Amino acid sequence: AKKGVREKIRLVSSAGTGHFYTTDKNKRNMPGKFEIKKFDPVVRQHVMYKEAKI
Amino acid sequence: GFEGGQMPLKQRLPKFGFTSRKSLVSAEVRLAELAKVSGDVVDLNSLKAANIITKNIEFVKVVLSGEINKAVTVKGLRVTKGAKAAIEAAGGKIEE
Amino acid sequence: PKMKTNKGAAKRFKKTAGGIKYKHATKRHILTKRTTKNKRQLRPNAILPKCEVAAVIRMLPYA
Amino acid sequence: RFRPPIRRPPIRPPFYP
Amino acid sequence: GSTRNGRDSESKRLGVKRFGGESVLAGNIIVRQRGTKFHAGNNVGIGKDHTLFALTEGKVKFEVKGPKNRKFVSIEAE
RNA sequence: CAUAGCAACAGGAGGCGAACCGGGGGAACUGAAACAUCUAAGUACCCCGAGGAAAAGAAAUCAACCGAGAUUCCGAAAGU
RNA sequence: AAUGGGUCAGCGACUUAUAUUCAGUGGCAAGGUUAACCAUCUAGGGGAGCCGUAGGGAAACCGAGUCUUAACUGGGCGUU
RNA sequence: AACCGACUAAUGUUGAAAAAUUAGCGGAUGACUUGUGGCUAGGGGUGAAAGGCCAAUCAAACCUGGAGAUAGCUGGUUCUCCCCGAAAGCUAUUUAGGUAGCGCCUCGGACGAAUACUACUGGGGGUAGAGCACUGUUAAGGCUAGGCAACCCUUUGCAAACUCCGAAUACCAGUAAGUACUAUCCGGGAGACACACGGCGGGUGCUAACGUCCGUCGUGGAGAGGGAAACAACCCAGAC
RNA sequence: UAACGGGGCUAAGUAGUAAACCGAAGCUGCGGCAAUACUAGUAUUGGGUAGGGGAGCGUUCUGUAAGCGGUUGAAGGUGU
RNA sequence: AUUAAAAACACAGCACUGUGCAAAAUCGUAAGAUGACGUAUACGGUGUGACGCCUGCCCGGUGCCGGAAGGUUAAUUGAU
RNA sequence: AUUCCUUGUCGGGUAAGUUCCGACCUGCACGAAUGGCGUAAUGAUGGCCACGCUGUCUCCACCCGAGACUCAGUGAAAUUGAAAUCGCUGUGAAGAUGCAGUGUACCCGCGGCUAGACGGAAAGACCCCGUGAACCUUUACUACAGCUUGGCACUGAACAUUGACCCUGUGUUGAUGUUCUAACGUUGACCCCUUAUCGGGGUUGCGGACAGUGCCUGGUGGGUAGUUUGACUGGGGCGGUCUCCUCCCAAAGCGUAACGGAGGAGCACGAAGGUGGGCUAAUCACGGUUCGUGAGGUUAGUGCAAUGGCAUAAGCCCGCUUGACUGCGAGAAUGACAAUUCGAGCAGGUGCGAAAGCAGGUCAUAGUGAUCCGGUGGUUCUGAAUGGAAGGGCCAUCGC
């Protein structure tokens, strides 16, 4: 049976490229919106990416 | 395509692509075929008369295949750089 | 009668000079867990293996 | 063990149809 | 009147894929293993799953080396 | 009042026929390797009405900025 | 000691149409071939069309290249 | 008694008869029985109810049509010679007696030793065996913490899921001789995917089974001949 | 009978030694046919189910054929 | 009807229930019928089954009957 | 007519009674209109007992007839590969007329009998199987009839109350109630067509915008219909199982079955990932209201099974971080295929490090789900007169 509780999230580029990474989080361990530097391929730069739904 | 009831190949693989409408009324023409045209002017009507393109064709690209031995003026059709060169080398023009 | 094309096969298998070309499976959903390597390498269309061809040809009589 | 069989049809000749 | 057993995984086709003396191209997988049953020696890389592969063309050589007497796969220039 | 009704008279019709035709109703087996959407099939069958044919037909049609010119039937486009 | 056959004679089961593909054979050959139809009718007309002559790409489109990618040292398919 | 019925038995069961006869048996002024004619019709009728009956037919009549329904099932499939010649496996399957790809057969084409056998060389083994160094398990004695006895020591065994060790074989690769139309690739056509026994290694079973499930080799299958009284599958041996 | 296949055997049993022989569609000899290679001869090869491949026989009908054979006896039937 | 004649069916009696008459109910798309030229002491359905003594407890479930407050809720409407 | 154990136990009846009768009550698993318990009479009803009676039997005998047998005439039948159609023991597709060995046996009828010819008859009804069929059931699925609900139509008028809205009390609409008649109903009466219990028309009464019907709509709906209801399986059912990972079976490459032996997974983690620096266990001994020293040598540890690994640690601690990067990818592994795995290196941009370097998640091997349909973002490729747009595509991603 499925015991998986980590919510999937889409991390979105802080540039307005609309490029997103996807991942998951434990919402208990991370209540707030996740933020992390990630390479945006459209602007070809490492920029901040921020959590969003789906 | 029936494989004993295992999900066949024609269903386990995804559909892909679309058909443009232009594709259905487009026709490549070899440079060698431009021989068959009667007269200097290579246009859609002259191609159709030569039966090089069917009568439903609207858009033609001439491609570098074979050789042109006459001076032809291609009006209205698109030509490849290589075909253009070959046309112009045989004393043809490419009209717009 | 005229042989009918299997439109399922037609929409999934395209004849090229290089053989019957197809889209790889497993790139539709449930992608987060997959590796970018795996996802990247599935993105190019492929040519069907020899064993898969005979059937496809019988399903694509005019292609 | 002996399991009582059903070897013949329940209606017997000469009527067996 | 039943078995609690029944189960087993798919065999993972591990083992030496290219033995001593075999000529290998760069990239060729030599060993597939779980952990470093064989260690990577000269001209041999080790993947994340501890796959040993040829970094250069040449001949596979196995060798016990070092104070622990560990087995090493190397590619010999030939 | 009139109409209904009733009677007379004249002219039609009714039934039969293998198919073809237009229309009104309209299956299921089967296929989908199960099955319900779907298929079979608007088929079989039932009914009505023709005619030597019937039906359709003279653009509130196409096309594509060029043009075509009712309907029907046949070849292709295209198993697109 | 599983099936079928009392015997004889007669009859009794891979067909036909259409399309796709492969092979042999013939014609013609970077061309090959006409369909309906016409016809003084196995002739001859009839070029609509189909196949070949270019590929790559989902596609626009480009084209002996193209697709991928910001770009490939590249790589896929193609060229011959 | 007639008449209507049908409880028992015997006969009969290729009958005298597709339900009777003989001897007995029940009702016999009634919810009786009988003639003639009517009506109800098929998912319909009718039923004091048995799924009874509806023309010797009924859990859905009969006829004709759809219709050559469908039938992964069973049967059957017709002249002759020549060449080659399987499989009963894997994978998947509302699949398991079907089917698909693959493996194996054949035919054509390409290709030509890249193939097989052997010697030599280089490899990786963790099996057989063995061992007790580990993990377990076992016996005796010692020594002794502890409360008789750990733990150690000496001796002594056991192991599919133990290993300080460790073959033969097999496999992979290279080098080389000789023998061989081999290997490979691309096409056309399949068939097969119920296997059997025997040897060897095993699981299962009782180291029972002409048992069952694998591995591997042989034969049978698809193989006659000689032997084993007779005897697919054993021994010898391949029938123009 | 019925646990040598039987008769029967005290060796016609068991073990061994020597030298024989019998014994197959195996091998050889002689004759012939075929497949495939090679260069008509060689060489190899020729059990066979499913199945693949190759080559034929015969039947009815059309042309060839208003030809050819036939009441001086066709087809069919029945012998050789 | 033709392997069961019975303890099975029916039965008088009993009870529940529907039904106010264009009755309920049933046949029928409908018209029209039966019910009934009847009218609740009648008619239909259901169960029980002469007669005697009796026929207990449970209204949670599922029916059925009644209640409507609120909650939910279709077509419709069409605010934003 | 119910009781499993069970032939319960006791009593009766019999020489002897699993039945019968009476009774007991630990009623497996009686019970009150699916009625409970009685009950005269009735029953081709079930059980049991007795008398009489007997060829039912001990145990048959004889006799009378109809067949059977013989003659004459007629003349079937199922069946049938072919038969020159013995016994026994053995063999053998495993129960032999037909094989082996052997024993026996002149040829052929007729009357009898039925042990065998796995005799004849009917393509087993049992059992299983077929992605067969039918009919039946229901709180299986999906429908439909019927019933029912509301909206709208056929369908109207006055008032009264009231809601909304409209303006400046006013209209415009909506309900609700009463009243009304003119639609509509009438299976009330009368008249006529008309000799008519039909029907129509007329008149009148009673109803009355109700009812009823059409379209739409919710509910109800085995009344009816179409269907579905898995496979493996030492028959089948019941149970168990179905995908993935680890070990063993597995025969020292790979692979290898059983309803064989054992365990695990269907995640976790923004650090538990990257990197730089650092560190090294278990358990004892001994001394101390965790501490110190020694022995020991990884017996520890590893986010979670097992196996293989791990000190250069892969184990433990810390700083800084986002390489848990995007495009690609020589070359391999591994699969029928779908798919799955490893990967140097290249480009871009990045983190840690003085630097060589390392980093495309995690010690590794489970932690998963094709396609279709659809959702979200991007692209702006397509997009049917044109320009847009919708809708397609492509890229990312979500929904089993």
UniProtKB/Swiss-Prot annotation, chain D:
- Free-text tissue specificity from the UniProt record: Large granules of neutrophils.
After translation, the protein is modified as follows: Elastase is responsible for its maturation.
As for subcellular location, the record says: Secreted
The free-text domain note is: BAC5 sequence consists almost exclusively of X-P-P-Y repeats.
Function statement: Exerts, in vitro, a potent antimicrobial activity. Probably due to an impairment of the function of the respiratory chain and of energy-dependent activities in the inner membrane of susceptible microorganisms.
In the record, the note on similarity to other proteins reads:
Belongs to the cathelicidin family.
| Official protein name in the record | Cathelicidin-2
To which species is this protein native?
Answer: Bos taurus (Bovine)
* Covered range of the whole protein: 131 to 147 of 176
